[PDB]
RNA sequence: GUUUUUUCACUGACCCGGUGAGGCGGGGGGGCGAGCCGGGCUCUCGCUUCUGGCGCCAAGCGCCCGGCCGGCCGGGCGCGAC
């Protein structure tokens, strides 16, 4: 072995993984943020019932620590639906509006019937 | 010449013969610079070749 | 015992011997940062009146202060 | 009660210079094998302007002895240099100008400037604009050199530093008088916070020595002792004679 | 036979003409903070002029020797913590249905039994880290008339011990077989270290300068004359 | 002898400067002039200066080592780079 650099520098050393005696806590925190918890009701201002005839989507009220990826997934377990794209914004009042843009396979007032608003 | 002059970030959509000239140095440096110095590279290679064989030519009378 | 032979002889710190010692390992102890753990006591003998029994858990910090 | 302004210097802050534009550090080469045996071959890429500094600089760039890397040095440029030209810097470099070599290796009433004060600091001695060191005499036992500065002060200099060749280049530029307070405030703007010198007489009492008074004089011998405390040593610091200049 | 396209390009290594070959800088590395002190405090053992009480460890048993006394402790070795199990079962056997000779392991053991003079031959350690655990026995065995021998290595002399280092090993009882042996390494080693001991007291260590500070005054004295 | 002291210089704490801590000190062998008659000593050198190219990841030479069928289809180590 011989010093090409006049520099030394800490060799690789061999470091293992976690091989624990014990998991730290118990059992895994379960997903608090459900499905059910993630939409917590839809809007049936006038505003928001055009919205359902007019351009046909649904608007819902979500939890404001939902991305758009996890209220599709939400919108298409809990109403047996598919989303075409979805549009979060939080309101001056401090919870988040969910403009869900149905895909234009589904009537939104006849699901909007379905979830029971009128 | 030869290469489009726009905002740098863009380069990456543009085909590489819009980036470049078809040439030795091209797209990097100019027509002018690069002959003059296939000349420079040249005459100073051959230079070396003119010492080279008056070195020892200059040794051998000793 | 040895350490009645060690205590005697780190009494005559202006012996050779001793001043010999007292300074290359102040030289050492410079080249060292302000403060690290010495691997064992530097006097095995000073540490046995102190309380060092030399068993696991038991650690020594050689640390300098400005004078 | 208050601080001096002087003392306020040093703290920093609002002294501090102004480095921002300021082109790199201006040094020399760094002393290697092929400074201290024989010599290596370097081009001036572009001479320069440096903000603060009255002398332009030198990218030269030399060729790396071993990684296939290539260097760039930023040398005070002496008189003459031009771009393209080849520089030279070793023990065994021919003695023509804008070329440093040790000052061993040169004869007495040669003119240098960036002169190395010790072997290795890479280049501190007369190196501001149109300033030049003559190599005075040699001292081969003991290995020394005498070269006078530009203050006109021979120094007995160790002759295993370097220096390159020539006068610093923007030489003569004092001649020019400032005309106006805009060509004054513009140079110290490149430089540090120093311009507007209010004196101190003009200052109240408690912010220099030389303040107050109903007449606007000093009072006190402006001469001070080299011993005064800061806020205090202000004026002619260690005046060893003073007034107008009379002989040489 | 030969391809003519195969030509012979040598490099010129030359100042400023090829590149520098990839060549040994083992000596010119920038170290490690602990690299760099263990080696230059070996350097003040030999710059610094060590007193006789510290500089007498150098002085150490040879090869053709050592080798002689490392198989003659092999033979005395006390036990390990396996074999101990084995005769402490055999106690129990007898109980439900004397001690050989050994050497003596550490300064506190031997000390006591050499002015107490059981000690026939002691086995110095040159290399112990806190010296002033053992600076005094060279002396002390002087006095009481008990032959000391000094060994390289206090971990080989630590491995007749079934232990990591060992500071002094002093051997007490031989077998009648051994006893021939142990003398015949007292009749080497009290001649090479007790008998000329007042030699020892005024042999100071280092005081050498640099090969190239000696390189120097080496070209000076030439010079002159 | 012991001690004090003065000047010369020593390095090894301590300080400084540079570096990516890249060739330090001694010795040896190849150039160069000087000196008795092929041999030898006290020395000197170590390759690049007409140009605003180019160069790194080795050629060369030795040396060992694994099949099909002394012959072809691939690896290592030493100098070159004391």
């Keep these: 072995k011989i010093r090409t650099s006049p520099t030394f520098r800490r060799p690789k050393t061999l470091r293992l993984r976690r091989q624990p005696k014990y998991p730290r806590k118990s059992a895994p925190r379960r997903n608090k943020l459900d499905h059910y918890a993630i939409i917590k009701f839809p809007l049936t201002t006038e505003s928001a019932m055009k919205k359902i005839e007019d351009n046909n989507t649904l608007v819902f009220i979500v939890d404001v620590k939902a991305n758009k990826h996890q209220i599709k997934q939400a919108v298409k377990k809990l109403y047996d639906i598919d989303v075409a794209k979805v549009n979060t914004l939080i309101r001056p009042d401090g919870e988040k509006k969910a403009y869900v843009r149905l895909a234009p396979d589904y009537d939104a007032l006849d699901v909007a019937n379905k979830i029971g608003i009128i | 010449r030869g290469v489009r002059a726009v905002r740098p970030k863009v380069l990456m959509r543009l085909s590489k013969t819009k980036k470049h000239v078809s040439r030795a140095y091209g797209g990097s440096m100019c027509a002018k610079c690069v002959r003059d110095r296939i000349k420079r590279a040249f005459l100073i290679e051959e230079q070396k070749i003119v010492v080279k064989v008056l070195k020892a030519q200059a040794q051998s009378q000793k | ?67 | 009660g208050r601080v001096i302004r002087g003392q306020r210097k040093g703290a920093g802050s609002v002294f501090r210079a102004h480095v921002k534009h300021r082109k790199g550090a201006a040094r020399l080469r760094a002393v290697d094998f092929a400074e201290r045996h024989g010599y290596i071959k370097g081009i001036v890429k572009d001479i320069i302007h440096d903000p603060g500094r009255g002398a332009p600089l030198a990218k030269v760039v030399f060729r790396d002895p071993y990684r296939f890397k290539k260097r760039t040095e930023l040398f005070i440029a002496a008189e003459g240099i031009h771009t393209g030209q080849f520089v030279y810097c070793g023990k065994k470099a021919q003695l023509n100008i804008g070329n440093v070599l040790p000052v061993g290796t040169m004869p007495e009433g040669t003119i240098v400037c960036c002169l190395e004060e010790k072997p290795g600091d890479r280049g501190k001695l007369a190196r501001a604009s149109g300033n030049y060191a003559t190599v005075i005499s040699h001292n081969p036992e003991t290995k020394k050199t005498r070269v006078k500065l530009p203050s006109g002060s021979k120094k007995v200099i160790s002759s295993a530093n370097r220096a390159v060749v020539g006068v610093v280049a923007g030489g003569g530029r004092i001649d020019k008088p400032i005309l106006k307070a805009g060509r004054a405030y513009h140079k110290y703007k490149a430089k540090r916070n120093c311009w507007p010198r209010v004196r101190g007489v003009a200052m109240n009492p408690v912010e220099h020595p030389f303040g107050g008074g109903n007449h606007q004089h000093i009072g006190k011998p402006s001469t001070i002792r080299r011993d005064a405390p800061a806020g205090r040593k202000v004026g002619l610091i260690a005046a060893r004679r003073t007034g107008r200049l009379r002989g040489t | 036979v030969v391809n003519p396209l195969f030509e012979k390009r040598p490099k010129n290594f030359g100042i400023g003409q090829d590149i520098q070959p990839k060549r040994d800088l083992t000596r010119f590395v920038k170290w490690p903070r602990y690299i760099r002190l263990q080696r230059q405090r070996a350097i003040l053992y030999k710059r610094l002029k060590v007193p006789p009480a510290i500089n007498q460890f150098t002085q150490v048993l040879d090869r053709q020797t050592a080798t002689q006394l490392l198989k003659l402790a092999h033979k005395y070795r006390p036990e390990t913590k396996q074999e101990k199990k084995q005769r402490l079962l055999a106690r129990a056997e007898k109980k439900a249905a004397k001690r050989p000779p050994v050497l003596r392991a550490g300064v506190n053991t031997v000390t006591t039994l050499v002015e107490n003079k059981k000690a026939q031959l002691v086995v110095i350690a040159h290399d112990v880290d806190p010296i002033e655990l053992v600076v005094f026995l060279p002396a002390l065995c002087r006095k009481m008339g008990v032959p000391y021998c000094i060994l390289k290595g206090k971990a080989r002399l630590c491995r007749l011990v079934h232990r990591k280092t060992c500071t002094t090993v002093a051997f007490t009882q031989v077998n009648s077989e051994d006893k021939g042996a142990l003398a015949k390494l007292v009749e080497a080693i009290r001649t090479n270290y007790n008998d000329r001991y007042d030699e020892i007291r005024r042999h100071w260590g280092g005081n050498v300068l640099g090969p190239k500070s000696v390189a120097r005054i080496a070209k000076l004295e030439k010079a002159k004359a």
Excluded: N
Excluded at chain 3, 2 to 11: N, S, T, V
């Design chain 3, 1 to 67: 015992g040895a350490y009645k032979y060690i205590q005697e002889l780190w009494r005559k710190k202006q012996s050779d011997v001793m001043r010999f010692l007292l300074r290359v390992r102040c030289w050492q102890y410079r080249q060292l940062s302000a403060l690290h753990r010495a691997p064992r006591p530097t006097r095995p003998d000073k540490a046995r009146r102190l309380g060092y029994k030399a068993k696991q858990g038991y650690v020594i910090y050689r640390i300098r202060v400005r004078r």
